[PDB]
Amino acid sequence: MKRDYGGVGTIALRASALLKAMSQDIEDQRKEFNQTEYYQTFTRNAVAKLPKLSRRIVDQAIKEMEEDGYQFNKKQVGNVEQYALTIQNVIDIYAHRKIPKYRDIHKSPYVIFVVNLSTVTLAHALRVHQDLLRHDLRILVIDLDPQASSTMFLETAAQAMLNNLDAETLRKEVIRPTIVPGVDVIPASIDDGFVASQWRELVEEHLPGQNQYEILRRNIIDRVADDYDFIFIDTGPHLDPFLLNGLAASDLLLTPTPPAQVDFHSTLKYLTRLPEMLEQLEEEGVEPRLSASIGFMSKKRDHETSHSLAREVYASNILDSSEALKKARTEAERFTKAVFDRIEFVRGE
Amino acid sequence: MKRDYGGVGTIALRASALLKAMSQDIEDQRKEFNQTEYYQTFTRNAVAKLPKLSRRIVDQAIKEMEEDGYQFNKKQVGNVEQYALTIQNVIDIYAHRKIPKYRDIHKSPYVIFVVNLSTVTLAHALRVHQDLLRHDLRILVIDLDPQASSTMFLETAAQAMLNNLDAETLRKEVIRPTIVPGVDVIPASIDDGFVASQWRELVEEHLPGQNQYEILRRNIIDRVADDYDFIFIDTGPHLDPFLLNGLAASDLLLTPTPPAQVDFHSTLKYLTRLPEMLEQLEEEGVEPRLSASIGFMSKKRDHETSHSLAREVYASNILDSSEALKKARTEAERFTKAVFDRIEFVRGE
Ligand SMILES: [Mg+2]
Ligand SMILES: [Mg+2]
């Protein structure tokens, strides 16, 4: 309440009022998802081209499945009904053919910490990758950064951590569905800034006797453990309690390294500070779950020079990646399967 | 200390070691300052074209000044020594002509809070603006964000706030000089993240009896008060103690509003949250100094639509701005003098 500071309130009132001007913008979000174009159609020959399958596996499965009930997807082109198999169609075929799902080879939840200085987009990528469907992946993305991941949609992760909810509530009330059926998101908000700020205090008041850095693991990860193969944690750079919760609940650090000689140094400085961050956990008497790290490149002088530099710092934990649709989409795909293979590499080995 | 988490330490050690690969990059910073090109040369006719001056004012001052000692700057082109007046030359002329400096009309330190979601660049702009030299501005930029402003150079602001230093130490040890002689910077670091995190705690231990939100004002602003006309505060979005210190020590909120319909909403959400932030100060028993706000545009569908929207929310506190050198440089200049005029407008009125 004073004069023009009593006017910041004025701009605020008008800002929230124009935020209602937003329904006109929600339809713009679909303009961004229309570019994703994901309702891939699969011709029986393509499916037969997939891993562990063949023109004869597809046909036997299709016939067999068709017979006990199952109804595959079809399109009516011209006057003929061609088969257009969906991701679930292909996924069920692998199940009919009895190929083991990822959840049949690996004990529940592998947690990944993504270094922010894109994530849901990676999660979507891993789920719908041709040579990866056989795994039937279940991925959840936890948003502990007051901004981006919540973009993919039709109670924040911070709130849920404090509300101390049970698996049934998390499953049916907090965890929200993304545009891709296999990937789920627990959203973030600006308002998480206030929680991140008064964390320990709020912890002591609502979660008595619980360690302030085991709360991500305790109240979410562990309660949704049998539900997801991969769990990606998205946080800001700046934050520390929320950033520390991610470092204590994750198994693998995933560090994306920018080509710009400008950003390459930011990342380098960031990475140079993680040890001190782990020590704060150690001081609280909590063991970090970290057991593996991976770093890659993206995106002319800088790029070409940065890639050869990352090898120096990441050593054996470095990867590759990026005319536009044909070429790039492909380059991207190759990256995804690269990331998956590395996780598999560092995991059950 | 465990296994591959005991390997994050490994990457860190190698990262800091490649950060020494940096002297090779410091010379790259000048590649960015060589584009600024600031050692403007002034021909006597140009100077005569400036405000409150004329071919006869310049000549009388030059002659007069030259006579009692003063030595103006000159260049040796071909075989003739033309006059190339510097910013100080023009500044001293106005002083000889007895035109009042900004520090002669306004009581010391007007503090500005810049909303981050560029600052030093604005400070440099205001200082060296042709029609603004007559003011002989003294500007300081406080960095309370773990990143950007420190870019312009040849003890962080966070540390100085805790060290509780006196004006002589701040003047001669913490405040560093920018590339432009009139603008000074108090740098930030990644390490401010740890301080921002354990603020109240650290405050209570090192600054007993001092209010945790009056520390920016108390330990820096007030001790450098007679030294600067404008003081810009640069902070992150995320931070809260450091962000609250800025809101309690500033007179004017300067909000730059992005054209992208994507970012325009981020800003809108941000602005919609300032009131709650002021209340936290109110709760600590501290009165915010905020007394004026200003918002502008920058940078095709979004832009053209956003500008007409900003008028709706900012009302009377909105401004204008942005082939490339001629046209743009000009457009930029016009913006700067626009910003100055608005500050003057909201100030002594
Ligand atoms: Mg423990
Ligand atoms: Mg007070």
Side-chain angles (χ1 to χ4, degrees), chain A residues 1-298 300-322 324-349, chain B residues 1-298 300-322 324-349:
Chain A
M1 10 55 89
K2 260 172 183 184
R3 225 295 89 66
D4 248 4
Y5 121 53
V8 158
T10 312
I11 296 165
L13 266 173
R14 292 192 287 220
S16 86
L18 189 153
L19 277 171
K20 282 208 296 174
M22 214 175 117
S23 52
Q24 308 167 299
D25 314 71
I26 296 288
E27 295 156 298
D28 179 290
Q29 300 182 289
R30 287 175 167 63
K31 304 180 189 175
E32 304 176 57
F33 293 177
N34 285 320
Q35 293 181 55
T36 304
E37 316 175 71
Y38 239 91
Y39 201 67
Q40 255 191 311
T41 289
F42 274 120
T43 54
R44 293 164 308 155
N45 292 288
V47 188
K49 295 184 174 66
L50 269 39
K52 305 234 86 172
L53 299 185
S54 66
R55 311 168 132 296
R56 290 191 167 162
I57 300 297
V58 188
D59 230 274
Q60 258 305 280
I62 288 191
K63 284 195 224 74
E64 245 153 302
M65 291 174 98
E66 221 138 65
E67 192 212 86
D68 69 85
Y70 201 101
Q71 198 97 201
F72 287 92
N73 194 70
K74 271 105 83 163
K75 295 192 301 183
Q76 175 61 297
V77 293
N79 47 290
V80 186
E81 287 204 70
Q82 310 270 62
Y83 272 97
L85 302 180
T86 88
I87 277 67
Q88 261 308 313
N89 284 162
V90 184
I91 289 183
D92 294 338
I93 285 173
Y94 282 101
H96 190 264
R97 197 60 178 60
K98 297 170 199 166
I99 284 86
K101 283 174 204 290
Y102 190 98
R103 65 187 81 162
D104 295 326
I105 300 168
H106 299 264
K107 156 77 155 184
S108 240
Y110 191 58
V111 178
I112 306 176
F113 186 92
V114 181
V115 178
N116 153 56
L117 319 158
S118 190
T119 282
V120 175
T121 214
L122 203 210
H124 286 173
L126 282 166
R127 219 273 145 159
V128 300
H129 193 311
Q130 281 186 18
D131 321 316
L132 248 31
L133 302 166
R134 72 185 280 186
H135 295 287
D136 193 36
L137 289 317
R138 299 164 301 147
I139 310 169
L140 168 76
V141 179
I142 317 282
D143 209 3
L144 266 302
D145 183 15
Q147 271 124 296
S149 277
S150 202
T151 296
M152 302 69 191
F153 253 62
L154 216 310
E155 191 150 0
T156 190
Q159 287 173 78
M161 286 183 67
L162 288 177
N163 282 13
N164 200 331
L165 297 164
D166 61 334
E168 309 96 87
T169 293
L170 293 175
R171 283 191 206 99
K172 298 125 200 163
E173 280 176 52
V174 182
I175 295 178
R176 296 275 109 210
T178 217
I179 60 150
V180 185
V183 180
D184 302 319
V185 187
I186 297 194
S189 175
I190 345 160
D191 295 19
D192 290 325
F194 311 90
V195 190
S197 295
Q198 199 185 73
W199 189 242
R200 183 178 61 65
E201 178 161 1
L202 284 160
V203 173
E204 288 174 3
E205 132 94 347
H206 298 103
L207 305 172
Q210 310 196 198
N211 186 104
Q212 56 166 159
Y213 300 140
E214 300 175 311
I215 301 171
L216 208 214
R217 245 292 151 155
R218 225 200 82 129
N219 309 168
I220 299 185
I221 302 295
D222 292 340
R223 302 176 174 150
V224 293
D226 307 305
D227 300 307
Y228 299 96
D229 303 295
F230 291 148
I231 289 180
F232 291 95
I233 304 310
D234 236 1
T235 68
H238 59 270
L239 230 295
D240 283 68
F242 287 1
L243 184 288
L244 280 171
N245 263 272
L247 291 191
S250 300
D251 289 290
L252 167 120
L253 187 86
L254 213 213
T255 311
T257 310
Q261 181 190 59
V262 189
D263 314 315
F264 186 76
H265 278 298
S266 304
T267 308
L268 273 174
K269 259 119 80 173
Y270 177 88
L271 296 177
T272 207
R273 259 49 161 171
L274 290 177
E276 301 63 59
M277 304 224 82
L278 296 176
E279 302 185 21
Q280 283 198 203
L281 292 174
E282 298 199 315
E283 278 164 39
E284 212 73 10
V286 327
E287 66 331 305
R289 284 179 64 63
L290 227 55
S291 55
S293 49
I294 295 300
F296 54 78
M297 212 71 48
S298 55
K300 299 179 180 58
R301 176 268 178 187
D302 320 296
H303 304 43
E304 294 150 45
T305 305
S306 304
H307 189 15
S308 39
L309 281 176
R311 296 191 175 67
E312 203 98 286
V313 290
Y314 292 148
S316 66
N317 3 303
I318 174 69
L319 275 187
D320 53 278
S321 68
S322 63
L325 277 86
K326 204 95 286 184
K327 319 292 265 192
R329 284 197 314 162
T330 299
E331 180 66 340
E333 294 172 351
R334 315 178 80 182
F335 166 59
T336 305
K337 202 256 188 301
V339 181
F340 180 92
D341 291 327
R342 284 291 297 190
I343 292 174
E344 228 59 37
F345 175 61
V346 200
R347 259 252 251 191
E349 300 180 0
Chain B
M1 10 55 89
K2 260 172 183 184
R3 225 295 89 66
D4 248 4
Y5 121 53
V8 158
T10 312
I11 296 165
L13 266 173
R14 292 192 287 220
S16 86
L18 189 153
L19 277 171
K20 282 208 296 174
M22 214 175 117
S23 52
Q24 308 167 299
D25 314 71
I26 296 288
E27 295 156 298
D28 179 290
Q29 300 182 289
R30 287 175 167 63
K31 304 180 189 175
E32 304 176 57
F33 293 177
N34 285 320
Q35 293 181 55
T36 304
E37 316 175 71
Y38 239 91
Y39 201 67
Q40 255 191 311
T41 289
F42 274 120
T43 54
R44 293 164 308 155
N45 292 288
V47 188
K49 295 184 174 66
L50 269 39
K52 305 234 86 172
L53 299 185
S54 66
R55 311 168 132 296
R56 290 191 167 162
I57 300 297
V58 188
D59 230 274
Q60 258 305 280
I62 288 191
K63 284 195 224 74
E64 245 153 302
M65 291 174 98
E66 221 138 65
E67 192 212 86
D68 69 85
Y70 201 101
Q71 198 97 201
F72 287 92
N73 194 70
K74 271 105 83 163
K75 295 192 301 183
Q76 175 61 297
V77 293
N79 47 290
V80 186
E81 287 204 70
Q82 310 270 62
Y83 272 97
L85 302 180
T86 88
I87 277 67
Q88 261 308 313
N89 284 162
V90 184
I91 289 183
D92 294 338
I93 285 173
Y94 282 101
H96 190 264
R97 197 60 178 60
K98 297 170 199 166
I99 284 86
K101 283 174 204 290
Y102 190 98
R103 65 187 81 162
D104 295 326
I105 300 168
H106 299 264
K107 156 77 155 184
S108 240
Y110 191 58
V111 178
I112 306 176
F113 186 92
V114 181
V115 178
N116 153 56
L117 319 158
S118 190
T119 282
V120 175
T121 214
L122 203 210
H124 286 173
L126 282 166
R127 219 273 145 159
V128 300
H129 193 311
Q130 281 186 18
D131 321 316
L132 248 31
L133 302 166
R134 72 185 280 186
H135 295 287
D136 193 36
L137 289 317
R138 299 164 301 147
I139 310 169
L140 168 76
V141 179
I142 317 282
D143 209 3
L144 266 302
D145 183 15
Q147 271 124 296
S149 277
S150 202
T151 296
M152 302 69 191
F153 253 62
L154 216 310
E155 191 150 0
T156 190
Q159 287 173 78
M161 286 183 67
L162 288 177
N163 282 13
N164 200 331
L165 297 164
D166 61 334
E168 309 96 87
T169 293
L170 293 175
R171 283 191 206 99
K172 298 125 200 163
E173 280 176 52
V174 182
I175 295 178
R176 296 275 109 210
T178 217
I179 60 150
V180 185
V183 180
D184 302 319
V185 187
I186 297 194
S189 175
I190 345 160
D191 295 19
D192 290 325
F194 311 90
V195 190
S197 295
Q198 199 185 73
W199 189 242
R200 183 178 61 65
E201 178 161 1
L202 284 160
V203 173
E204 288 174 3
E205 132 94 347
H206 298 103
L207 305 172
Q210 310 196 198
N211 186 104
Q212 56 166 159
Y213 300 140
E214 300 175 311
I215 301 171
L216 208 214
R217 245 292 151 155
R218 225 200 82 129
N219 309 168
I220 299 185
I221 302 295
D222 292 340
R223 302 176 174 150
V224 293
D226 307 305
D227 300 307
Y228 299 96
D229 303 295
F230 291 148
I231 289 180
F232 291 95
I233 304 310
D234 236 1
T235 68
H238 59 270
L239 230 295
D240 283 68
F242 287 1
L243 184 288
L244 280 171
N245 263 272
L247 291 191
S250 300
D251 289 290
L252 167 120
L253 187 86
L254 213 213
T255 311
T257 310
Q261 181 190 59
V262 189
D263 314 315
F264 186 76
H265 278 298
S266 304
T267 308
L268 273 174
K269 259 119 80 173
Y270 177 88
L271 296 177
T272 207
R273 259 49 161 171
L274 290 177
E276 301 63 59
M277 304 224 82
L278 296 176
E279 302 185 21
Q280 283 198 203
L281 292 174
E282 298 199 315
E283 278 164 39
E284 212 73 10
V286 327
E287 66 331 305
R289 284 179 64 63
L290 227 55
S291 55
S293 49
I294 295 300
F296 54 78
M297 212 71 48
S298 55
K300 299 179 180 58
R301 176 268 178 187
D302 320 296
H303 304 43
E304 294 150 45
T305 305
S306 304
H307 189 15
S308 39
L309 281 176
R311 296 191 175 67
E312 203 98 286
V313 290
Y314 292 148
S316 66
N317 3 303
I318 174 69
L319 275 187
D320 53 278
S321 68
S322 63
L325 277 86
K326 204 95 286 184
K327 319 292 265 192
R329 284 197 314 162
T330 299
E331 180 66 340
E333 294 172 351
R334 315 178 80 182
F335 166 59
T336 305
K337 202 256 188 301
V339 181
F340 180 92
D341 291 327
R342 284 291 297 190
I343 292 174
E344 228 59 37
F345 175 61
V346 200
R347 259 252 251 191
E349 300 180 0

